[PDB]
Amino acid sequence: SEQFTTKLNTLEDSQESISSASKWLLLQYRDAPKVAEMWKEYMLRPSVNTRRKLLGLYLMNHVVQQAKGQKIIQFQDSFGKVAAEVLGRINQEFPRDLKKKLSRVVNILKERNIFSKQVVNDIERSLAAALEH
């Protein structure tokens, strides 16, 4: 629902506040397919700063990380799909500093087995493409 954008637009730059938001976003699993699309648009919105995009990335990470604990594939699969594309694209805007921070998020998604091997491979491929172009 629109509650995603409510928490996203009011998303504060702090892990505590980010987790607090994601706690409620776990209830959006019914519309997760659409939430991921909203997240995608946000991440690929030119009116959003690269810092604010990374902040949004942090929010997603918390949601799917908790979804991993809650075993909610509605978030894992949905966000994984769009993440494969987004993560590659936004690295063309992110500076080296924020690109490193991004790669840390990716490492978490992989190492914690949050996203499937298919999704991870798709991410890594798009990341390589981002490095190439």
Per domain, the residue ranges of the chain are 1-133
Going 102 to 92 to 35 to 49, the CA torsion angle's sign is positive
CATH topology for the 1-133 domain: 1.25.40
3-state SS string for 29-95: HHHHHHHHHHHHHHHCCCCCCHHHHHHHHHHHHHHHHHHHHHCCHHHHHHHHHHHHHHHHHHCCCCC
Q: What share of the chain is helix, strand, coil (3-state, %, to 5)?
A: 80, 0, 20
CA dist 108 and 112 (Å) reads 6
The tokens describing 64, both together, are 């799917």
Specify the experimental method. NMR
